[PDB]
């Protein structure tokens, strides 16, 4: 239909500010696929969305939170040790750099979260976090194993998106925190190759054995409330 | 204190979108492909509704895709596809939508959203795999129909203002024709592969009606 219709009687409203602490814990995931043949070649090392769930205290209440971490704007690198069946090769491996973004979707079970409605403005003041790459060994059938090591980026808050999903009957909120990246030390390399001194975070072992990365701070919301 | 009231905006909607794919060959002799995957795709267009010319933007992405593979053998000369994506009934297609219409500008303080949309069938086109020697295997077919499964309102807050967008989620049903890869044992599988999901179409279209209830100044 193509119409405009008045659904209620004029009412009174005012803007109210809400400030709340937030703790964002998340982690990456990777997909590593080998090529067939003898076993010296890898076809793909890429980032994959990863979920994390946890609980933390805020204002004397235990808050249960869920996050999903994904990346965008990743860069494709490769390593060609040669065309022989016995030459080490990585056809494609992803690296996040300053032209990439990390997104962390966040939801929590607090009444404050469910009550985010008619939000006019939302700003976040979050600490940065450094994500560093752990080692990843490439187990060749014969010979010493090349090892990817290093790499690091720091994450900096760059906007927040509030999403409200409308299904057959009710509404569910989600916040997406976007992070811009700055490359940091150490650079990454692959032992036993001439690949070294590159900056950014590869997808081989982005969590470096950590159970999660954490970004904490506060965010303020200004919403329209009845007057 | 300000004065506000709820308004309902009923409008027809035309959603045009398309897929994109990434096809990466393995280095070497030329018989191995490493990946065939879906990638997000943007589309922009204009349409008319009750006298107003509406300019719209969409971004189409998929989630829950399935990783298939074809292993013709471990010899350098055997055709292989290490990983190709297929959307099936456990997958979702999402279409983000924005338009420049006056009604869309009032979608800031939203009480509810509803959409009644037609379904659309997306069918795969052919994709040839040029081998160094021998006849070329061709991936052909595949199809899914898209069914509206919810709408999400997104508001992006950056340094100063807020940008709104709608995300339409579609659940899928597999349809005829099934897909296969000629010159191989792979045949009659159901779902839409990432090889050529647009089948030479400039875009796919889903149209219907949209209902918005929001709080606006009095």
Swiss-Prot record, chain B:
It is found in: Virion. A motif (YGL motif) lies at residues 190-192. Changing residue 75 to D: Slight loss of infectivity. About 50% loss of association with liposomes. Residues 1-218 are annotated as: Spike body and stalk (antigen domain). Residues 131-151 are annotated as: Hydrophobic. Homotrimer. The trimer is coiled-coil stabilized by its C-terminus, however, its N-terminus, known as antigen domain or 'body', seems to be flexible allowing it to self-associate either as a dimer or a trimer. Interacts with host ITGA2 (via ITAG2 I-domain); this interaction occurs when ITGA2 is part of the integrin heterodimer ITGA2/ITGB1. Interacts with host integrin heterodimer ITGA4/ITGB1 and ITGA4/ITGB7. Interacts with host HSPA8/HSP70. This is Outer capsid protein VP5*. It comes from Rotavirus A (strain RVA/Monkey/United States/RRV/1975/G3P5B[3]) (RV-A). The chain holds residues 259 to 476 of 776 of the full protein.
């Amino acid at each position: 239909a193509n119409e405009d219709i008045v659904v209620s009687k004029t009412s009174l409203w005012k803007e109210m500010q809400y400030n709340r602490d937030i703790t964002i814990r998340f982690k990456f995931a990777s997909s590593i696929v080998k090529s067939g043949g003898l076993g010296y070649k890898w076809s793909e090392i890429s980032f994959k969305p990863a979920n994390y769930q946890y609980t933390y205290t805020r204002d004397g209440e235990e808050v249960t939170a869920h996050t999903t971490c994904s990346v965008n704007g990743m860069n494709d690198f490769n390593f060609n040790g040669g065309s022989l069946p016995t030459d080490f090769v990585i056809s494609r491996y992803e690296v996040i750099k300053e032209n990439s973004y990390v997104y962390v979707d966040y939801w929590d079970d607090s009444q404050a979260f469910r009550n985010m409605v008619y939000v006019r403005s939302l700003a976040a003041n979050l600490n940065s976090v450094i994500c560093t790459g752990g080692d990843y060994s490439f187990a060749l059938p014969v010979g010493q194993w090349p090892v990817m090591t290093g790499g690091a980026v720091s994450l900096h808050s760059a906007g927040v998106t509030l999403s409200t999903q409308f299904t057959d009957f009710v509404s569910l909120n989600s916040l997406r925190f976007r992070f811009r990246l700055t490359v940091e030390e150490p650079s990454f390399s692959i032992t036993r190759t001439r690949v070294s001194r590159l900056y950014g975070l590869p997808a081989a072992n982005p969590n470096n054995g950590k159970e999660y990365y954490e970004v904490a701070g506060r965010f303020s919301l200004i919403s329209l409330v009845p007057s």
